[PDB]
Design a protein around this ligand. Structure first.
Ligand code: NA
Lengths: 154, 23
């Protein structure tokens, strides 16, 4: 009912992976506070989680001024990447106000798609060295896939 | 042989405690 109570529901649904219900709730918050940056960010996340990449990208691109330096560069680049706009995704990553681990993760994937395998390997070696998650075996698999792609050429 | 989209795993809400608190 109240905005903080709506946020409580956003958090509960998101934590449980119910992005559909979180999105419905976030949209109610946006009806009350139309340019709430956190709500716009959550909406974009819900849309990506439900495979609505065009809609997510549209949210970002129609709120450019409001999202300045919370530009959602990771999410924007992610959507472009999933929409096979790889050059756009690269540009978005490179022009991001603040670099982050998630941006670097996506950057590795973008370089792989661009067949820039040497720089890709450097990015993945770095990610494996400095990781703080449970995805290192998956990253090592990515590393091996990159080397396999290179081997095709020699 | 496999290549994983690990970036998808990082698609997550920002911290919400300020919004929960009505800060
Ligand atoms: Na990755």
């Amino acid at each position: 009912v109240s905005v903080p109570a709506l946020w409580s529901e956003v958090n509960r649904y998101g934590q449980n992976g119910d992005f559909t219900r979180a999105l419905k709730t976030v949209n109610k918050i946006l009806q009350i506070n139309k340019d709430d940056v956190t709500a716009l960010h959550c909406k974009v996340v819900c849309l990506i989680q439900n495979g609505s990449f065009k809609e997510a990208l549209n949210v970002i691109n129609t709120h450019t001024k409001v999202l300045a330096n919370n530009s959602l560069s990771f999410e924007k680049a992610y959507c472009e990447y999933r929409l096979n706009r790889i050059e756009n995704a690269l540009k978005t990553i490179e022009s991001a106000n603040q670099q982050t681990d998630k941006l670097k993760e996506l950057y590795g994937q973008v370089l792989y798609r661009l067949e820039r395998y040497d720089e890709c390997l450097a990015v993945y070696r770095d990610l494996v060295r400095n990781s703080q998650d449970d995805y290192d075996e998956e990253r090592k698999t990515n590393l091996s896939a990159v080397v396999a792609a290179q081997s095709n050429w020699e | 042989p496999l290549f994983f989209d690990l970036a998808l795993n990082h698609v997550a809400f920002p911290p919400l405690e300020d919004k929960l608190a009505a800060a």
